[PDB]
Amino acid sequence: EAAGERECELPKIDVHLVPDRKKDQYKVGEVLKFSCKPGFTIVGPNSVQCYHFGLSPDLPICKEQVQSCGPPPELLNGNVKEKTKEEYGHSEVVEYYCNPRFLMKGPNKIQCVDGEWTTLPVCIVE
């Protein structure tokens, strides 16, 4: 009996972690987005899939204390349109804008994760 499959059940995550679904058994191809508790920051993979060998990649962790990352980086052919505060914070996104000659490819905003900002929008001439 049983196919070649090997389906998933929610593994032992962090006590302060909370999965998006939060179901007991995950079907192969379920993406278990994780997050941490209200006052916790999730660090690591915030989305793992249920594969036919198990939930992968391995689970992220929870940090209450993160960095504020200071001000955001510059944009290559734009700038930050928002008020650059000396202290942003985790999950604080920064709306950028590129010049009126470019198309903005990636996310115009980026949020700082742990203490590192995510991948910039990047714009190209239209």
| Secondary structure of 76-126 in HEC code, one letter for each residue | CCEEECCCCCCCCCCCCEEEEEECCCEEECCCCEEEEECCEECCCCCEEEC
Enumerate the domain spans of the chain. 1-63, 64-126
Experimental technique for the deposited model: NMR
Closest CA to 112 of 87, 78, 76, 82: 87
Q: What is the CATH number of domain 64-126?
A: 2.10.70.10
* Equal CATH topology for 1-63 and 64-126: yes
Cβ contacts of 84-93, under 8 Å, gap ≥ 24: 88/112, 90/41, 90/66, 90/114, 90/115, 91/41
Distance of CA 95 to the CA centre of its chain: 16
Closest CA to 32 of 4, 15, 8: 8
Q: How far apart are CA 94 and CA 107, in angstroms?
A: 10
Give the Cβ contact number of residue 76 at 10 Å: 14
Q: How far apart are CA 104 and CA 120, in angstroms?
A: 10
Task: Supply 68's token pair.
Answer: 């504020």
Q: ω into residue 57 within 30 of 0, thus cis?
A: yes
Q: How far apart are CA 95 and CA 23, in angstroms?
A: 34
DSSP codes, 21-48: S--SEEPTT-EEEEEE-TT-EEES-SEE
Q: What is the CATH number of domain 1-63?
A: 2.10.70.10
Q: Are strands 47-51 and 61-63 parallel, antiparallel or unpaired?
A: unpaired
Q: Are 43 and 63 in contact (CB under 8 A)?
A: yes
Q: Which residue has the tokens 């996104």?
A: 93
Q: How far apart are CA 63 and CA 44, in angstroms?
A: 10
Q: Which residue has the tokens 């993160």?
A: 66
